[PDB]
Amino acid sequence: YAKDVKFGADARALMLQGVDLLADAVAVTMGPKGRTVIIEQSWGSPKVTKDGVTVAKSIDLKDKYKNIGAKLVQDVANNTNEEAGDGTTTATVLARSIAKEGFEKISKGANPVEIRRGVMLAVDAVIAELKKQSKPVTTPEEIAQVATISANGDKEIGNIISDAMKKVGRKGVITVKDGKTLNDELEIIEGMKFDRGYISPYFINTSKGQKCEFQDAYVLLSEKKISSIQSIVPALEIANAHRKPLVIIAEDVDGEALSTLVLNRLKVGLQVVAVKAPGFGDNRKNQLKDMAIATGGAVFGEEGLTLNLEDVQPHDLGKVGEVIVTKDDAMLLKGKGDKAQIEKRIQEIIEQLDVTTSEYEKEKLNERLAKLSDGVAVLKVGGTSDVEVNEKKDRVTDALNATRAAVEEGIVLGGGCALLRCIPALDSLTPANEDQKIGIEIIKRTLKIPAMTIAKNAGVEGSLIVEKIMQSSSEVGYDAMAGDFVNMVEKGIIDPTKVVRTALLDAAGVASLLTTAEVVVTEIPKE
């Protein structure tokens, strides 16, 4: 395939136009007075978003040379999402500023490799200073403030997130789902949800709602399918002797066992129910064992130390204070497993979690941890239309990510005030020569851009706001929503350290290396 090659200033010029166009497109969404973007979809209704990384990833340009810069800065935003999930617009504005200035600063005498090296040194100093500036999290009021900021100032969302974190712990499982109502709702899930329904309608004993409700039931856990009359009779005999209900959790129930169970239940009122085993593969076995410890029962049919169904004993069955079964799910509430083994299981699970990490295994392990310890919370997001629901869940997910991050790390000043306060640290650096001298001064001049961009999106002159803020004491900042100068901490306009430091480091490294180009090669367009 034939290709075209361009050299030097023209290539840099097209590079910078492409970067500027993409970054201008993304920048409109930033801050409390930013606006949303709609992206056309070829198969239905277009999404409406205020998400920088979404905008960046959604834009590709026909012009080949602009396309390099476009794809690189969309990747920068994508990396920001990959790591923090937020801060992406800040990363983008930093990237455009540094790339632009570098392109208009490069000269015959400059040496980009030392320039970038000095950039790396200065940014490392910046993150060091930020880490020294960080403060721990202590109050639910602070978490709620962070959540409100991340949710674009939605106090109801912030309150719901704070309540959820209180209920499920700061490391609990929170999931977002579409609502069918005008208002958002917080639903708390306790115990064990495993999405298996009743096997036979005959087992229903509660008319209102067609529910199976039993008290003080025996628990039978079978890893393998239950088939034989000889395998089933001893357990039912034990249950009838003790006059207690029985719940049978098994891989499957075969025709003969199912017919016997339903027929006996119909003709005697025998309190029995059967349900499918949850999870597939080794996951099924994991849940079965976890339930065994939780209820104080045993798992029958294990490959190691195989325990036979023919000789089931009364002490091998778990005990649960309440069981609720419906068409979609089944519930055991008050297991009777011993606390010491429960603690052993939780400890081993967290150790397994700490050894090897992947998205699937971490998700399953976290789900198990919550199920075994505290439960999970699901926030259902309501709305009149799919586009509106999507637009709000975007902000809700951003808020959740931000709150989790502010749980892992400390806080810094929001609104760019932390970055503005970081300028004195760069004045202590001593460059060995001109290339890093240029790098440090560039960083000292670029780190300020977010505040100007925020003020511009607010319709005020960022230069005047930043000058008054930097001339003010460290505890004073500018609230862009009110349009005033205030002490930021009492208003609660604060940001997590990790997001900003990651965005700065990634954007600076990537774009600063980009600024070393002299020649660009692209394929000639085909017919």
Added chain:
Amino acid sequence: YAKDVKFGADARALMLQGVDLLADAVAVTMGPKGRTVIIEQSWGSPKVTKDGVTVAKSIDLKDKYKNIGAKLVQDVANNTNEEAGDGTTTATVLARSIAKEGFEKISKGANPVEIRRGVMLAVDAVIAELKKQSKPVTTPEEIAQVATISANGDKEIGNIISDAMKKVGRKGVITVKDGKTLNDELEIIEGMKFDRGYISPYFINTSKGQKCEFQDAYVLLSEKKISSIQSIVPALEIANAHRKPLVIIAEDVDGEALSTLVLNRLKVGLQVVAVKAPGFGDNRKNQLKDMAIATGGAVFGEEGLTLNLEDVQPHDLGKVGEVIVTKDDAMLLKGKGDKAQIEKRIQEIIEQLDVTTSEYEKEKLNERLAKLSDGVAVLKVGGTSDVEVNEKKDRVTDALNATRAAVEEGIVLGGGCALLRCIPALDSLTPANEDQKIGIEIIKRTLKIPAMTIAKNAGVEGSLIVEKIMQSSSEVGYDAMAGDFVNMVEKGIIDPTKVVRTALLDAAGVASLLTTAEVVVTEIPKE
């Protein structure tokens, strides 16, 4: 397919334009002040590179007649990579210089075949003089200097490479892998890594990390799959009699043996573990025998002298002081094989290595040598993005190649100073007639180009630098990074002989033969 034919001066002119364009494109990356090139990729993010051969192989032009010269000089660079892996830009600059001058020198009276013959004679003299100039390697400081030069002046990379060579020997196995961290790290691998995990989770005995840790274990090596209770019982009986742990390395474990092993381990605490055999085909057998000598054990089931599992004896099992097994790998640390047989095995392996050579077999043999003698080192290259990681591993691989080459051969002056010092040798040649007289003078005028190119990339006039250097004493040279005249040896700016001599010989031979063209034929472009 219809084709077009052109004759003489026009064909040569287009040839030289194509060569010049490609070589100009490649030359920007050369030397300490060279810059990087980005190459568009049709399936994702574009690579950023400073690699001459990569640039050359990545460029193809639409114009048919330029394309001949383009492909020939990319091949020249490719040959340089095929042999040295470095020096490719130097080879390219030599090729362009000689090709250009030849094209603008050819005349009715010239006879290219004697011209090229004289070129070959003179270059042979040049390599002879270089080989006389070469000096052996003696110090880790010199190796570190070479590594730093090849890594584009990265002292951290040079230090890490020097430490790696110290740990694994000058002929050890070093591999490059992607990092997940901001900084590079050096990891040392001792013993035998074979990438097989534990067969059964039941065998785990260490809670923290889910590891199998055993001391003074017996080693069972089975080439074939282990199936029968009769085949397994004697070994477990021996192990229990001697009250020592057992590790079973076998092709596979069947259902009955696996169930018996896991059940016994669970019910008694019997110290047993089983793992898959590593390697496939005859490679598996090779590792099994090598482990047999290493541990002092025997291999059961061999086709020759078949040894039965039914009559296993205590002395047929290897002994190892420590074994560590985890999900991904297993480790035996302190084998008890006899040193004389270990030495016999290493000797036979190196003899096999010396008989027949191919990339796969050499790789496997080197891996075995390191595993049996000293181990292997892996350098993990960190970074914030795939493009950055790729760009740095390129330089790291170049550096590794350069250090290996400087281990095989001697050193010469870097920066082109060796080639500049080679001019007096050509003044001793006596040509028989005009065609070789022209060839020798051409070589004497072209060998100087690298220094001018280095100075030009440094932004200084190569003619003045080269003149002052050649007017200076032999031990004085110009450091392009500082921009000064210095004694090169103390600064450590030195180059391996092989790379330069190979690049010179290949470039001269190929392009000098190319300079014999009069007519070029290409196919007419299709619609």
Added chain:
Amino acid sequence: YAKDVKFGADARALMLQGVDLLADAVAVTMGPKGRTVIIEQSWGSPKVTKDGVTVAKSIDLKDKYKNIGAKLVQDVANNTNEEAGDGTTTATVLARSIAKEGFEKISKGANPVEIRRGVMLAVDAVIAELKKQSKPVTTPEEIAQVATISANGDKEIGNIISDAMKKVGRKGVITVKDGKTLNDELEIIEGMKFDRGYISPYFINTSKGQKCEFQDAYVLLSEKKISSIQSIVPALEIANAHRKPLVIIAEDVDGEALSTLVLNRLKVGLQVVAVKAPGFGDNRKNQLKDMAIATGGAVFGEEGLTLNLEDVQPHDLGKVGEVIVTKDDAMLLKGKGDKAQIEKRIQEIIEQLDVTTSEYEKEKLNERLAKLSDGVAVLKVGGTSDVEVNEKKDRVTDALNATRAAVEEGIVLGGGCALLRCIPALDSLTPANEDQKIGIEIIKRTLKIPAMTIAKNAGVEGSLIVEKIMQSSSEVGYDAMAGDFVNMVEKGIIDPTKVVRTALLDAAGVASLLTTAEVVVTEIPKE
């Protein structure tokens, strides 16, 4: 398909332009100062060649009417290659000269059929005179001179070819193969090479190189596969009784026989080896019988006079003084077959060679002859690149062809001096009428062209050189490389008769018949 038809002078004109263009393209490569041609390849690197027939076959033109002449004269060159493999440029220059003059000589009154008849008579006289001029070959110095001429003056190639002919005889087998080194090498193959490796690594007895080396071994030749223990035991018993090594050459070895052999070798040190039979089909049988006579053994399992393995006798096994077996090949050096049967076999083979001829059967028969009598020589051609290696093997193959031809026939003056000296013979012819008078004068004027072309390629005026040569005594000629007049025989610039006579006859007949055209029909180009 619609077609276009043209008549007379226009058709002849386009015919001659096409012939002239193609011939001009080819002519640049001729003689000691000719240059090379590069031909574009659509799948990789273009070949570089100095070969007239290659150039001619590689050229096709879009213009339909030129294409007839182009294809006809490429065919002429191809015929020259088909017969001689050299002389192709001379044939082409003769063809263009005669075709051109004929086209510009044809007139209303000329009768081309008698013109061509006279051409045929005169050329027949020319070959008669050449055959009278021919002289036998007597000295290795003369063969070396011929080889040097054909190799474009390469004395190293000429020396290597002369040494090869000395080692393997003037009718031995010589093959060309790619080298992996900078220099060419001559390798001599004696005995029997059949490209089969050892069946089992267990049979290896020499550590250095992993070779099977045995002395005074028995030879077992089995046409069919060896399977049964009953079939194998008697031979091994005989070998152990006589305490001599055994080599088993068989179609294949089955699992049981292979296991027994390897196990016995391992446990006793029994000197046995097994190898695959070489050749497929009846070729396998031919080699097996030939080895039977060579070693004095017998072939077991033949369809006629089937000899059983169960009753093998000590005298049925061949004897060989030394056997070397490695991974790729096996060698028996000093067979003990009776000379009278060896001579009978060689005689029958050469008689079979003389009865029926095809390329495959002749190749196999010649290979067998060399293997049974003297062995074969392989010249390995070195070089830095595939294109260079190809360019040199082309000349080497040309040289081999030329030396073989000069072994079959005599010699004449090179440089066209023989053809120049042939002019007096045509002055004795008496034409019956004008058409053959024209034919004879045309031939007398065209036969001189090669010398002018040689001088033109040398950059001197061929007319003056030819005039001085023809004015000189018969033993004096012009060396174009030095540019002087010399006695050709002492310098050794001489040519084989067959190549020149064949080229002249084919070119004259074909083009002279071509010169009888009046109308040309071609298809109208499609869309």
